[PDB]
């Protein structure tokens, strides 16, 4: 009988056998849950419990043992598992299934155990309905989701409160046995580790049975999630015996293709409106190949290896199912074809489109001029915007530690072409003063300002070098631009000057949102995921991509 | 009683239980082997067999079922497994261990089964002693190796005759349960897939128990090894029921540091002898910064990201244990510190040293000239030699599909800076004819030769584009050099000219050995591994590196 806690004593000569019978009517799935524990603190004689089905046999040893790194062992006493859910179809029949539960051990004196069995009342997840459940490293849980007729793709969202312990969320097709162990859950299907948040995007076309399992498994230790380790002189960590993690799981229906074309149209058209706006001004007004050839060879030749590398990354993550390889923003990531994140890709179109307009207007200026005012450097930074925009997008196909270096290498390429923290701050101080009645006052002001960041870098010591470099470059360039304004006023159009500040003010708002942070473990990078914010298709980092284009464009227009 | 085959019938009401008792004396390990089979062709009622130890329980179902890709099912009737080998120490005692074997099922009529049990006579592998054994997908195997006192590192080498089926060889520490299943063997320890050859290098410092298990597991399909699939209309592939693979395993003692230092000293001292010969010639005789700066900036800024990517690969392959990530030559791979292949790294010192000597002699020539003869292109090609050598070494830290593109990208960059198969052959023909009484005859000869290579490329269609490009370039350059020789002879030192041909012949000899080929599955790349050939520390590809270095040096000296 389910919902009852059996108690018994097992030893060498005596074993206990309990046969359970139950039925599962068609169109209803009934998963059995086994609840066992043992009070035997000894490990030389663990109690062995087996559950036998019509086709599958599952067995475990109690108290459960885990062998983490640095040869620490653990004694988990409460163990539990879910059996393979037999599925019934329109071929009707009250299937009078029976499940054998047998327990035995070889302890010379004995080992106490209490066994409880019960069907899971909430085993089939419902769409958009949040469910709450508690999982333990020795008590894994998994549930079945069935696709609806209209919906063709879903996003499964999991949120926890306390970051530790580490946990893994896996999605597999319905072919039992179900892989719900720490050493085996990673073999099949899609999965990702997590501490606080997770999100897996699925398509119905990849599941022939139009129903899939969702498996939750809690790790014994927390290295894989970037956690620490309490150094204890006792090999058997008896303190780590009641690990738990309150969990909430919600399955939302993925957006339809209607918003896909709406968001894409919005991106293209507004920059097309910039084309129309510039053309309207032109009609109203109507009423050096060495650098080009060298840079085009450098850009093309450098791009191809990273595209081959990244498309290789994209392919392997697509087939292996290891979703912790790429550091996406899994709450606001949208797939199309082979790309697993399309919003982060299309969002870089503005860089390509705005830069194209910059090259055309400079060409127009050059043509009119022909019919120290040089546009060669303008073309170099104009191409710089194009190449980075395409290259940054290809980085976002699968963001990682490896391909971030290639993201900023091209910026380092151009910077050179134009030409431990104490040392780093001191060198930055030297660069600030070497780069540049009242002339001395402003020079002291600029050096004092650059010294404030020097104290910031030396004390705070941020983990992102590129962000620190860009902030220094942004602050210094605006200072030079502000320098140009004040003396021009003192020397006796304007809208572009004002507009540059507004977008730059907007740009830095979304720059510091850090929704994805790859320097930590992939689980921690998923703590900072945030939902879609623009047209239900874009997130904050894409908004950073948009404003960074117009901020650079307006600043470049002043230049 | 071991070495006996029991026969029995199973059904709902009757189960069979057989208790075995045996002892394992100290310093001797005794692994039990279970050999089960069932004749029930039905899959709706498989017979479930469990083996219970003092601590561990292992259960399985017969006929074993596998679910490969494309939803093909496989039914194996012969199953087999090895139990946890209980270890005994100098704390003596004839441990009178017991092992229960319980077989049961719920088939309405029943199922036949035959069960045999036996201790493995050859369970502890001996050093340098080849062992032969047959493995099956449903009959995995594993054996224990114990390190000797003097030896501190070993290389385990596995050889098979027939390439298929695909197999996996793993090495784990002694902490049972032992991972000997297709879905679980990949979790812990080191492992690699293979068809014909495999080799794992192990150090004693990484195993606290100074003894490790080696597990052979045969895959159900051959997709992971690049195999094909017989498309059959029957879902239950009854033909795939007797898969077997003969195997030979041999553990060789890894070389000591003496040969390491001998080979390193040999290389360094022969190139220092080239230096000494150049200095002796000089003593006997005694009796443009824009290009440099641009090339050094480009080289450094392009090199740094690929070094970062390659060191990340090395770290992940070192920590994960996935040895199929890098396409080494595992028979002649030697570790030192964090590098898992040192010979392929040290072998590139010749490129750097020969390039350095070339730069020094060009500088000497320039200095003597100062006190259309331009050396700028000579400096550019010397820097190209340096950079290509360093980058080839960094690629050889871990060879892969991804980083070969970066390997060829620097050469492509240099070629550009100096400036579907039918279309490729036509374009190659056009390039050959565009690049270049008797002048017509020799031009026709060269065009016909390039047409012969065009036909080769169009018909054979090699999978390596870089090799084909390098061969074409080498042939054209040698043709140009021979042309210069003959027209200098007709116009009315030499040792270098003579030696260039010999070193190029040796270079091609060792280049066409293709010991590693990454375009296929890693198992196929391991099919072509060859043992160490020079000083017991170098293989054919390192000899290719050396001969390419000296051939390039001599050819450039001719130039
Ligand atoms: C469950 O099935 C077994 C045999 O299949 C039978 O003996 C038992 O009575 C069944 N349980 C119930 C409650 O009928
Ligand atoms: C064992 O589990 C049962 C239910 O699963 C519970 O009632 C009992 O308190 C547990 N025993 C211990 C010692 O935790
Ligand atoms: C037959 O299947 C359909 C859809 O699967 C279901 O709605 C219906 O209830 C089934 N019929 C019976 C008698 O259960
Ligand atoms: C093996 O052990 C069991 C109990 O531990 C005992 O009954 C049996 O006699 C032993 N076998 C032999 C051959 O003594
Ligand atoms: C089953 O295995 C035993 C030994 O393991 C062997 O003697 C017997 O021939 C096998 N039966 C079949 C049908 O293969
Ligand atoms: C004690 O251990 C050593 C080394 O492990 C072994 O050679 C020796 O035979 C052992 N003593 C006995 C009595 O087995």
Author numbering:
A (entry chain B), B (entry chain A): 47 to 333, 441 to 524, 539 to 586, 628 to 644, 681 to 736, 743 to 809
Q: Which sentences did the original study use to describe this structure?
A:
SIDT1 predominantly localizes to the plasma membrane and enhances the cellular uptake of synthetic small interfering RNA (siRNA)7 and plant-derived microRNA (miRNA). Mechanistic analyses found that uptake of miRNAs by SIDT1 is lowpH-dependent. We first solved cryo-EM structures of SIDT1 and SIDT2 at overall resolutions of 3.33 Å and 3.17 Å, respectively. The electron density maps exhibited well-defined main-chain connectivity and side-chain densities in the ECDs, while the TMDs have relatively lower quality and resolution. Both SIDT1 and SIDT2 form homodimeric structures involving their ECD and TMD, exhibiting a high degree of symmetry with a two-fold rotational axis perpendicular to the membrane surface. Bioinformatics analysis predicted eight N-glycosylation sites in SIDT1, with three glycosylation sites resolved in the EM map. The SIDT1 ECD consists of two subdomains, ECD1 and ECD2, connected by a flexible loop. A disulfide bond between C130 of ECD1 and C222 of ECD2, along with another pair of disulfide bonds between C212 and C271 on ECD2, contributes to the stability of SIDT1. The dimer interface of the SIDT1 ECD can be divided into two regions. In SIDT1, the dimer interface primarily involves TM2 interacting with TM5 from the other protomer and is driven by extensive hydrophobic interactions. Cryo-EM structures of SIDT1 and SIDT2 show highly conserved features despite only 57% sequence identity.
Human SIDT1 and SIDT2 are closely related members of the SID-1 transmembrane family, and have been implicated in various biological processes such as glucose and lipid metabolism, innate immunity, and tumorigenesis. Here, we present the cryo-electron microscopy (cryo-EM) structures of human SIDT1 and SIDT2. Both structures reveal an overall architecture of a dimeric arrangement composed of an extracellular domain (ECD) rich in β-strands and a transmembrane domain (TMD) with 11 passes, highlighting the remarkable structural congruence. Importantly, the ECDs of SIDT1 and SIDT2 bind synthetic plant-derived miRNA only under acidic conditions.
